[PDB]
Design a binder for this molecule. Structure first.
Ligand SMILES: CCCCCCCCCCCCCCCCCC(=O)OC[C@H](COP(=O)(O)OCCN)OC(=O)CCCCCCCCCCCCCCCCC
Ligand SMILES: CCCCCCCCCCCCCCCCCC(=O)OC[C@H](COP(=O)(O)OCCN)OC(=O)CCCCCCCCCCCCCCCCC
Lengths: 124, 459, 101, 72, 88, 105, 110, 152, 60, 176
C-alpha cells in the first residue's frame, strides 16, 4: 500500500500506536491531560447557569488573526515569492492579452474584405 | 428634482426638532414618503429626457439610481435602530443627520448635468462615509480603512479634477448634453491619451479593479451595518455612472486603450470570486463578490455596445439590493454573536427558519437565478463580451462555476448542519430586521417584472 | 475494560435523572387548549370551472385579439376529402399498381 | 411475545451439513442457533428463480384461453 | 410507520433470549446481573462475539470503546436504553 | 480482416453502366398534395403513397386506434422493398467491383 | 418514467417497512413477506431489460435494432450490446439478493 | 483578549516556542511552525494535514460537524479539510494505482473509438434514393434559379 | 392490524397477495395475448432476401 | 459516544478491535449467512491460535502484519449500519434535534398552551441553580491535582448531592 498526500495511510499501518515506550507514552498522557484541562473548561463553561453569551472560542480568534491580520507583519520578500508573485499577477494577464488582440485583429481584417459576412445580427 | 431633495433637506431639522422616542418613527416614516416623490421621474413618456433646471436633469440611467438612493434610506435608517440603541440622544440623531446627507448629495450627483457639480458631490459624499465608519465601527481597524477609503479615492479623483478643467478651457461649458453634441474626435496623441487615465481612473477606483480594491474589504468589514449598504449599493455604482457619461468624449481611443482594464477585471473577476470561496469572515465575503460583479461593469463600459450598458444598469442596481440585503442577513447575526466569522454559527434554520428563506432568495440573487435581473445583467454583459471576443466565456464561465459555490457555501455553513448549541444568545428574529429583507426582495420581485424601467440610455 | 465502580454512579445517577427528564411526556390527559360528493363535486367547481372562466376570458379576448399569439399548423389535408371553407375537394391519388403482402 | 428459546434446532437446515465441515476441523460454531430463525420456521427454504419471473403465469394463462375462445 | 416503541422488557426478555443461543456458555442458568469473564467462563474475544448479536438485533453498531465495558447483560440492557431514550 | 480488397467504401452508382433499357423509378404521389400533407423531409420515400393512407385512417378512425395495422403492412412492405432495392445495388456494385477487377486480365 | 418511478417507489416500500436499511446485503426474502412489492418490482425490472412487450420493447427494440442497422461505429455497438446484457445482470441482482436468498435482516417484523 | 494571547512572528529564541505552545495549548515537542520561507505563516503551527473525516465520527466533540474541541489548535487550511469539501482519509486502493486504472481505462477506451470510426459497423446497403432529384426545394432551393440534372 | 412478530412468518391480509398475484397475472395474459397476435418480434415477416443468391439477372 | 477514548492502555483492545472490524468486513464478502457462519470460525481459530504468547515482539508482528494483509483483503462497500458513521440515517434526524435552551424564548399564547410542561421545567432550572456551586466545589476538591487526567468522570459521592456535569447528558434531545 503506497500512500500519498491524499489517501493518507491509516493508523493501523504507520508504526505509531505500537511503541509503548516510557518517552513515547508520556507524550500521549500530557498530550491528553491538556485535552482534559480543556474539554473540562468547555463543559464547565458550556452548561454553567448564567453563561448567557456564547463560548468565545479563542482558538478560532487566533486562527482568523493569523490568516488575515498577521500576514503582512510576517512578509519578507524573497525569491520563490516575487518571481512567484509576478507570474501570478501579470502572467495570465499578459497571456489573455495576446489571446484577445489576435481575435480582435483576426476578426477585424476579415471585415475589411467581407470574409466575415455577418449573420442576422443586431447585438453589434 | 428640487422637489425631491429639498424635503430631504427638511428631514434634517426634523431629527433635531423631534423628541428621541418619536424621531426614528418620523424620519423613518417620511423617508418612505420621499421615495414616492422620488419616483415621479419614471414618467418618461418620450425620449425627451427630463431636463428640469439648468443644473439638474434626469435620465433613464440616473432615474433608477435616484430611486434606489431614496429607497435604501428607510431601509438603512431602520437597520441601525438596534445598533446604537444604547448611546446618547445626540449621536442617535447625528448618525441620522449624516445618513440623510448621503441621500441629498447622491441625488444631486445622478441629477447633475455637469461633472464639477458631480465632482464636488463625488467627494462630498465622502465626509458622511468616513464619519460613519470611524465613529461607529465596532473594531480597532476602523481607522486604517477610513484612510484607505479617503486616499485610494482622491489619488484617482484629483487628476479627474485636472481633466474636467481642461475640457472647459477647450470648450467652455463642461456639461453633459452639449459635449455629447460638440464631440470632436481625438488624435490618439500621448498628450491626448493620458487624459483617459485622468477622466477614467477615479471611477475605476470606485468600481474596484483587481488592484486598488483594498479599500473595499477594509471599509465594509468595519462599517457598522449601513456604511456597507451605501458603500456597496450606490457609492460603488457612483463610479460606474460617470464612466457612462464621461466616456462619450473619448470614444475613438478607448477601442485599444481599455484592453488592460477590460482584462484586469475579467481575470480578477475570477480571483476575487475564487477568494470568495475560501474566506473566513462573512462581511469580508459579500465584498469580494461585489468586486467580481462590478468587475463586469468595468468590462461593460469599455465595449460601448448598447446591451453592455443594459447589462450594467441591470447588474449594478440588482447587485445593489442583494448586496445590501446580505449585509442585513449577516448583521442580523453579528447583533447576536458579535463575530463576523462564518463557521462560528453553522447550523441555523433550526432557530431562524424564516430568515433562512431570505438567505436563500438572496444567494440566488447573488448568483444568477434566471427569471431575475442579476442574470439578465450577467448575460447581456456576457453576450457583448462574446461579440467582443468569443473566448471570454472561458473566463465568464469559470466565475459562474465559482459563483454557484460560495453563494451556496454561505447557505451551507450558516444555515445547514448541526446547530451551535453553545449559543443561548440567538434571539429568533425581531420584526424589524425581518422586514429589512422584504424591502430588498419584493423590489427585485417587482423590478424583475418590469425591467423596462431599469435599462439605460440605449433601450 | 469493565465499568470501574467510580464510573458507575455517574452512569446511573444520570439515568434516573434522564429516565425522569425523558418522562417530560406530553400530558395525554389534556394538552394544547386550542380555543365523496361534497368533497369532490366542489373541487372541480373551485378549480376546474372557475379558473376556466378566467383563462377563457383571457385566451378568447386578449390572445385571439392579438395577431400571432395563437398560431397553429395546418389541419393536415389528405387526398380525397373536402374543406369547410370553399368546397375545394382535392383530387385523389393515382394507380397503386400492386403489392404482394 | 418472543416464542420459546427451544424451537430453533439446527437439524434439517443448511446449517446441518455446514456443521460437518467444521466438525471435520473441530470448532463447533457456538452460534448458528441464533442465526437459524430463517430456514426452519415458515421460511421453508425453497426459492427457485423460475417462481418470480413467471409468478402469476397460471391464472393469467388460464385467463387467456377464455379470450382465445371469445372471438366467436 | 411501524416497529413499536421498545420499552426495557422487550429488551431484557430479548437480550437474555439471545444469550441462550450461544451454546458455549449460558446453560439456562445465567441471570441478568451475571458478569462474563469471572463467573461464566468467557474470554475477552468471547465477548466481542456477544455484542455483535445485539448489534445484529437492532442496527446501531456499538463503538469500539463501549463493548470493552459491557460485560453484565444488564449493562447491555443499561446502554441500549440510555441511548434509545426509553421509559417515556 | 480475412482480407477484403475493396468491396464497398460506401458509394452507389459510380457507373450507371449495364443493360440498355433500364427503366426509370416512378413516384406515385403528386408533390403539392403530398408536401401539403405535412409529411417530413427525412421521411418521404417513393413509398410515401401508402403512408398517407396510413394516416387518413389514423386521422379519421381516431378512436379504436388499432385500425391501421392493415395499412401499415401495406406501407412498411413497400419500405421493405426499397431497403432491398438499394441492397441489390450493394451486391451489384460488389459484383461490379469484382467484375471491374475480373476485367483486369 | 414508469420504471424508476416504480422501483424507487417499490423499493421505498421496503426501506420504510423494515428499518431505514436500503442495501441488498441485509435483506433477502421480499417475495414471501411481500407478495405485492415483489410482484411489481418484477414488472419494473423485467420491463427494464427486454421483455418482448412490457415497454422495454417498444422502446428498446427499435434502439437495439437501429444501432446495429446503421453506419454509426464499431466499438460503441459492442459496449452497448454488452451493456444491453448488463441491464439484465444488475436487474438480476436486485431480484436475487432482495427477492431470493433466504432472508437476512433483523428479527422484528415491522 | 490580550496582545500576547494572539499569534506572532516565527519564534526564534526557543524560550518563545515554550511560550507559543502554551499559548496554542500544545505540547512543546508537538510544536513546529512553517519553515519561515517568507510568507505570513508566523508562529502558527503546522498540524499535519488531517482532514476532518478521520477524526472520530464517534467521541462527542464540542465542535460537532467540524470534529474539534474548544482549543486544540485549528488547522490553517480548515476551509477544505472540513467534512464537506476534501477527504484525505485512507483509501482501500493506493493512489498511484487509482490514477492508473482510471486514465488507463479511459485512454484505452478512447482509442477503441478511433479503431471503430475507421471500421464502422455499416449495413451492406446503398444510400437512400429520395423521390425527386433530392427534392431540391423543401430541402432548400429556389425554383427561379436552375433545376438540377440528376435522375435515377 | 398493528401486529409485529419478532420471528415466525406473519399474516398476509389478503389484499397485498391477491393484488400482487393479479398484477403479475395480468402480465402473462397481455404478454401472451400480444404474442399470439403480434408475433413480429422474430424477423418480422419480410424475408431477408439472400444477400447474393441471385445469378446476375438484373445486373448491368 | 458516552465514554472517552484515552491513550490505549494495552495491546488488547488493538486486537479486540481487529476482531471487530475484520469480522464485520467478512459478512460483506459473505453476503449469505451460512457461508458467513463457516468462514468466521476459521477466522476465530486464527486468533484462538496464537492466543497467548508472552513474546510481545512476535505477538505484535502477527498483529501489525495482519493489516499488511487485511488492508488488501477488505471490502470497499462494507455493511455499516444506519445510525452509524458514514452510512445513511446518521445525521438524518438532527435537523429536528433543537437544543432545548430555545424553549426559554416562548411567551403566552405560545407556552401558555399546556402550562403543565412548564410547571416541571421551572423547578428543573431550580435543581440546576441550587446544584451548581455544590457541583463545581466537588470538582475543585477532587483528588485530581496532578498529571494524568482523562476526564476523571466524577460521580456524586453518596449523599443528597447531584452529580457532576449532567445538563449535557440529561436534556440532550431525543434520538429517533
Ligand atoms: C399617508 C401618505 C399618503 C400619500 C397619498 C397616498 C397616494 C399615493 C400615490 C402615490 C403615487 C404618485 C407618486 C408620484 C406623484 C408625483 C406627482 C408630483 O409630485 O408632481 C408634481 C405635482 C405638481 O405638479 P406641477 O407640474 O409641479 O404643478 C401643479 C400645478 N398646481 O405635485 C403635486 O402637487 C401632487 C403630489 C402628489 C404626491 C403624492 C405623495 C404625497 C405625500 C406627501 C404629502 C404627505 C402629507 C402628510 C400629512 C399632512 C398633514 C395633513
Ligand atoms: C405569474 C406569471 C403569469 C404571467 C401571465 C399573466 C396573466 C395575466 C395577464 O397577462 O393579463 C393581463 C392583461 C393585460 O394585457 P394587455 O392587453 O396588454 O392590456 C391592455 C391595456 N393597455 O389584462 C388582462 O388579461 C385582464 C383580464 C384578466 C383575466 C384573468 C387572467 C388569467 C390568466 C391565467 C393564465 C396565466 C398564464 C398561466 C401560466 C402561468 C405560468 C407561470
Amino acid at each position: 500500500y503506497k500512500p500519498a498526500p491524499l489517501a493518507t495511510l491509516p493508523s493501523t499501518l504507520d508504526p505509531a500506536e505500537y511503541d509503548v515506550s516510557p518517552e513515547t507514552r508520556r507524550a500521549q498522557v500530557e498530550r491528553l491531560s491538556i485535552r482534559a484541562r480543556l474539554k473540562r473548561e468547555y463543559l464547565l463553561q458550556y452548561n454553567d447557569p448564567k453563561r448567557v453569551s456564547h463560548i468565545e472560542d479563542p482558538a478560532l480568534i487566533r486562527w482568523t488573526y493569523a490568516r488575515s491580520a498577521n500576514i503582512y507583519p510576517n512578509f519578507r520578500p524573497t525569491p520563490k515569492n516575487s518571481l512567484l508573485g509576478a507570474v501570478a499577477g501579470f502572467g495570465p494577464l499578459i497571456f489573455w492579452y495576446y489571446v484577445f488582440k489576435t481575435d480582435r485583429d483576426r476578426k477585424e481584417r476579415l471585415i475589411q474584405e467581407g470574409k466575415l459576412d455577418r449573420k442576422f445580427n443586431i447585438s453589434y | 428634482m428640487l422637489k425631491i431633495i429639498l424635503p430631504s433637506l427638511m428631514l434634517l431639522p426634523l431629527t433635531w426638532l423631534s423628541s428621541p422616542k418619536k424621531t426614528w418613527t418620523n424620519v423613518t416614516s417620511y423617508s418612505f414618503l420621499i421615495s414616492l416623490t422620488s419616483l415621479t421621474l419614471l414618467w418618461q413618456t418620450d425620449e425627451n429626457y427630463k431636463n428640469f433646471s439648468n443644473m439638474f436633469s434626469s435620465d433613464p440611467l440616473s432615474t433608477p439610481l435616484i430611486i434606489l438612493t431614496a429607497w435604501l434610506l428607510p431601509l438603512m435608517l431602520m437597520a441601525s435602530q438596534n445598533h446604537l440603541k444604547k448611546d446618547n440622544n445626540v449621536l442617535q440623531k447625528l448618525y441620522i443627520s449624516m445618513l440623510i446627507s448621503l441621500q441629498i448629495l447622491l441625488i444631486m450627483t445622478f441629477s447633475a448635468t455637469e461633472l464639477i457639480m458631480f465632482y464636488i458631490l463625488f467627494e462630498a459624499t465622502l465626509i458622511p462615509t468616513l464619519i460613519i465608519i470611524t465613529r461607529w465601527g465596532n473594531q480597532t481597524e476602523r481607522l486604517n480603512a477610513g484612510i484607505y477609503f479617503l486616499f485610494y479615492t482622491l489619488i484617482g479623483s484629483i487628476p479627474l479634477l485636472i481633466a474636467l478643467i481642461l475640457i472647459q478651457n477647450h470648450v467652455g461649458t463642461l456639461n453633459l448634453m452639449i459635449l455629447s453634441f460638440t464631440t470632436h474626435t481625438l488624435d490618439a496623441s500621448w498628450s491626448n491619451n493620458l487624459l483617459w487615465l485622468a477622466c477614467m481612473m477615479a471611477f475605476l477606483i470606485k468600481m474596484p479593479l483587481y488592484g486598488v480594491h483594498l479599500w473595499l474589504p477594509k471599509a465594509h468589514v468595519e462599517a457598522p451595518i449601513a456604511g456597507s449598504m451605501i458603500l456597496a449599493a450606490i457609492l460603488l455604482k457612483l463610479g460606474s455612472y460617470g464612466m457612462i457619461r464621461i466616456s462619450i468624449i473619448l470614444d475613438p481611443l478607448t477601442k485599444y486603450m481599455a484592453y488592460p482594464f477590460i482584462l484586469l477585471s475579467l481575470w480578477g473577476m475570477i480571483m476575487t470570486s475564487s477568494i470568495c470561496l475560501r474566506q473566513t469572515d462573512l462581511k469580508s465575503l459579500i465584498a469580494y463578490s461585489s468586486v467580481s460583479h462590478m468587475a463586469l461593469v468595468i468590462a461593460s463600459i469599455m465595449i460601448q455596445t448598447p446591451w453592455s450598458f443594459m447589462g450594467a444598469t441591470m447588474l449594478m442596481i440588482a447587485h445593489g439590493l442583494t448586496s445590501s440585503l446580505l449585509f442585513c442577513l449577516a448583521n442580523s447575526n453579528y447583533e447576536r454573536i458579535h463575530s463576523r466569522t462564518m463557521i462560528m454559527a453553522r447550523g441555523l434554520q433550526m432557530v431562524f427558519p424564516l430568515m433562512a428563506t431570505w438567505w436563500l432568495m438572496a444567494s440566488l440573487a447573488n448568483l444568477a437565478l434566471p427569471p431575475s435581473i442579476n442574470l439578465m445583467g450577467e448575460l447581456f454583459i456576457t453576450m457583448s463580451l462574446f461579440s467582443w471576443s468569443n473566448f471570454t466565456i472561458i473566463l465568464m464561465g469559470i466565475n459562474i462555476i465559482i459563483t454557484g459555490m460560495y453563494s451556496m457555501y454561505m447557505i451551507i455553513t450558516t444555515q445547514r448542519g448541526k446547530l451551535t448549541n453553545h449559543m443561548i444568545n440567538l434571539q429568533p428574529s425581531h420584526t424589524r430586521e425581518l422586514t429589512l429583507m422584504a424591502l430588498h426582495m419584493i423590489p427585485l420581485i417587482l423590478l424583475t417584472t418590469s425591467p423596462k424601467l431599469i435599462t439605460g440610455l440605449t433601450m | 475494560s469493565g465499568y470501574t465502580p467510580d464510573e458507575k454512579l455517574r452512569l446511573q445517577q444520570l439515568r434516573e435523572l434522564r429516565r425522569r427528564w425523558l418522562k417530560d411526556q406530553e400530558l395525554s390527559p389534556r394538552e394544547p387548549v386550542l380555543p365523496k360528493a361534497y368533497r369532490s363535486s366542489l373541487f372541480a367547481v373551485s378549480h376546474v370551472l372557475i379558473p376556466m372562466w378566467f383563462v377563457h376570458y383571457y385566451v378568447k379576448y386578449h390572445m385571439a385579439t392579438k395577431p400571432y399569439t395563437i398560431v397553429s399548423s395546418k389541419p393536415r389535408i389528405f387526398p380525397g376529402d373536402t374543406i369547410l371553407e370553399t368546397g375545394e375537394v382535392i383530387p385523389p391519388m393515382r394507380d397503386f399498381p400492386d403489392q404482394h403482402h | 411475545e418472543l416464542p420459546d428459546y427451544r424451537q430453533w434446532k439446527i437439524e434439517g437446515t443448511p446449517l446441518e451439513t455446514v456443521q460437518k465441515k467444521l466438525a471435520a476441523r473441530g470448532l463447533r460454531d457456538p452460534w448458528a442457533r441464533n442465526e437459524a430463525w430463517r430456514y426452519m420456521g415458515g421460511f421453508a427454504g425453497n426459492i427457485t428463480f423460475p417462481s418470480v419471473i413467471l409468478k402469476g403465469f397460471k391464472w393469467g394463462f388460464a385467463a387467456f384461453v377464455v379470450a382465445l375462445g371469445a372471438e366467436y | 410507520s411501524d416497529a413499536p416503541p421498545l420499552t426495557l422488557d422487550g429488551i431484557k426478555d430479548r437480550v437474555l433470549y439471545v444469550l441462550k443461543l450461544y451454546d458455549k456458555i449460558d446453560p439456562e442458568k445465567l441471570s441478568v446481573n451475571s458478569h462474563f469473564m469471572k463467573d461464566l467462563g468467557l474470554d475477552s474475544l468471547d465477548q466481542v462475539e456477544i455484542i455483535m448479536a445485539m448489534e445484529d438485533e437492532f442496527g446501531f453498531e456499538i463503538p469500539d470503546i463501549d463493548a470493552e465495558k459491557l460485560m453484565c447483560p444488564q449493562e447491555i440492557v443499561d446502554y441500549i436504553a440510555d441511548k434509545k431514550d426509553v421509559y417515556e | 480482416a480475412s482480407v477484403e480488397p475493396d468491396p464497398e467504401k460506401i458509394p452507389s452508382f459510380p457507373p450507371d453502366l449495364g443493360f440498355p433499357e433500364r427503366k426509370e423509378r416512378v413516384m406515385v404521389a403528386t408533390q403539392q398534395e403530398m408536401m401539403d400533407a405535412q409529411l417530413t423531409l427525412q421521411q418521404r420515400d417513393y413509398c410515401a403513397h401508402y403512408l398517407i393512407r396510413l394516416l387518413k385512417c389514423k386521422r379519421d378512425s381516431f378512436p379504436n386506434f388499432l385500425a391501421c395495422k392493415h395499412e401499415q403492412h401495406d406501407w412498411d412492405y413497400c419500405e421493405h422493398l426499397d431497403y432491398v432495392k438499394r441492397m441489390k445495388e450493394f451486391e451489384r456494385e460488389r459484383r461490379l467491383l469484382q467484375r471491374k477487377k475480373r476485367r483486369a486480365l | 418514467a414508469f420504471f424508476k418511478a416504480m422501483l424507487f417507489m417499490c423499493s421505498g416500500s421496503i426501506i420504510h417497512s423494515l428499518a431505514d436499511e436500503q442495501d441488498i446485503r441485509k435483506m433477502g426474502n421480499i417475495t414471501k413477506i411481500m407478495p405485492f412489492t415483489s410482484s411489481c418490482l418484477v414488472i419494473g425490472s423485467l420491463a427494464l431489460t427486454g421483455m418482448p412487450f412490457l415497454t422495454g420493447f417498444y422502446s428498446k427494440d427499435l434502439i437495439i435494432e437501429a444501432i446495429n442497422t446503421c453506419n454509426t461505429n464499431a466499438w460503441a455497438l459492442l459496449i452497448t450490446l454488452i451493456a444491453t446484457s448488463m441491464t439484465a445482470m444488475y436487474s438480476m441482482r436486485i431480484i436475487y439478493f432482495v427477492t431470493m436468498t433466504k432472508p437476512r435482516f433483523p428479527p422484528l417484523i415491522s | 483578549m490580550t496582545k500576547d494571547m494572539l499569534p506572532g512572528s516565527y519564534p526564534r529564541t526557543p524560550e518563545e516556542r515554550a511560550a507559543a505552545a502554551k499559548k496554542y495549548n500544545m505540547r512543546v515537542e508537538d510544536y513546529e511552525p512553517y519553515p519561515d520561507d517568507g510568507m505570513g505563516y508566523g508562529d502558527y503551527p503546522m498540524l499535519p494535514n488531517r482532514s476532518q473525516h478521520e477524526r472520530d465520527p464517534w467521541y462527542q466533540w464540542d465542535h460537532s460537524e467540524l470534529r474539534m474541541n474548544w482549543g486544540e489548535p485549528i488547522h490553517w487550511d480548515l476551509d477544505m479539510y472540513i467534512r464537506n469539501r476534501v477527504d484525505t482519509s485512507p483509501t482501500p486502493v493506493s493512489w498511484d494505482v487509482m490514477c492508473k486504472h482510471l486514465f488507463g481505462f479511459v485512454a484505452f477506451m478512447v482509442f477503441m473509438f478511433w479503431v471503430g470510426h475507421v471500421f464502422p459497423s455499416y449495413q451492406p446497403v446503398g444510400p437512400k434514393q429520395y423521390p425527386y432529384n433530392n427534392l431540391y426545394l423543401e430541402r432548400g432551393g429556389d425554383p427561379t434559379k436552375e433545376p438540377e440534372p440528376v435522375v435515377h | 392490524h398493528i401486529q409485529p412478530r419478532y420471528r415466525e412468518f406473519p399474516q398476509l391480509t389478503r389484499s397485498q397477495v391477491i393484488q400482487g398475484e393479479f398484477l403479475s397475472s395480468l402480465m402473462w395474459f397481455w404478454i401472451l395475448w400480444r404474442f399470439w397476435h403480434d408475433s413480429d418480434a422474430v424477423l418480422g415477416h419480410f424475408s431477408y432476401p439472400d444477400p447474393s443468391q441471385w445469378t446476375d439477372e438484373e445486373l448491368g | 459516544a458516552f465514554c472517552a477514548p484515552p491513550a490505549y492502555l494495552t495491546h488488547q483492545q488493538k486486537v479486540l478491535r481487529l476482531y471487530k472490524r475484520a469480522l464485520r468486513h467478512l459478512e460483506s464478502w459473505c453476503i449469505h449467512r451460512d457461508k458467513y457462519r463457516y468462514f468466521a470460525c476459521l477466522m476465530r481459530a486464527r486468533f484462538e491460535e496464537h492466543k497467548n504468547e508472552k513474546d510481545m515482539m512476535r505477538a505484535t508482528q502477527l498483529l501489525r502484519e495482519a493489516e499488511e494483509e487485511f488492508w488488501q483483503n477488505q471490502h470497499p462497500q462494507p455493511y455499516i449500519f444506519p445510525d452509524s458513521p458514514g452510512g445513511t440515517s446518521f445525521e438524518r434526524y438532527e435537523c429536528y434535534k433543537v437544543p432545548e435552551w430555545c424553549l426559554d424564548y416562548w411567551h403566552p399564547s405560545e407556552k401558555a398552551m399546556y402550562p403543565d410542561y412548564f410547571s416541571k421545567r421551572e423547578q428543573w432550572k431550580k435543581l440546576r441553580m441550587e446544584s451548581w456551586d455544590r457541583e463545581v466545589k466537588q470538582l475543585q476538591e477532587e483528588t485530581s491535582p496532578d498529571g494524568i487526567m482523562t476526564e476523571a468522570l466524577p460521580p456524586a459521592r453518596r449523599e443528597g448531592d447531584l452529580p457532576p456535569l449532567w445538563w449535557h447528558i440529561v436534556t440532550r434531545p431525543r434520538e429517533r
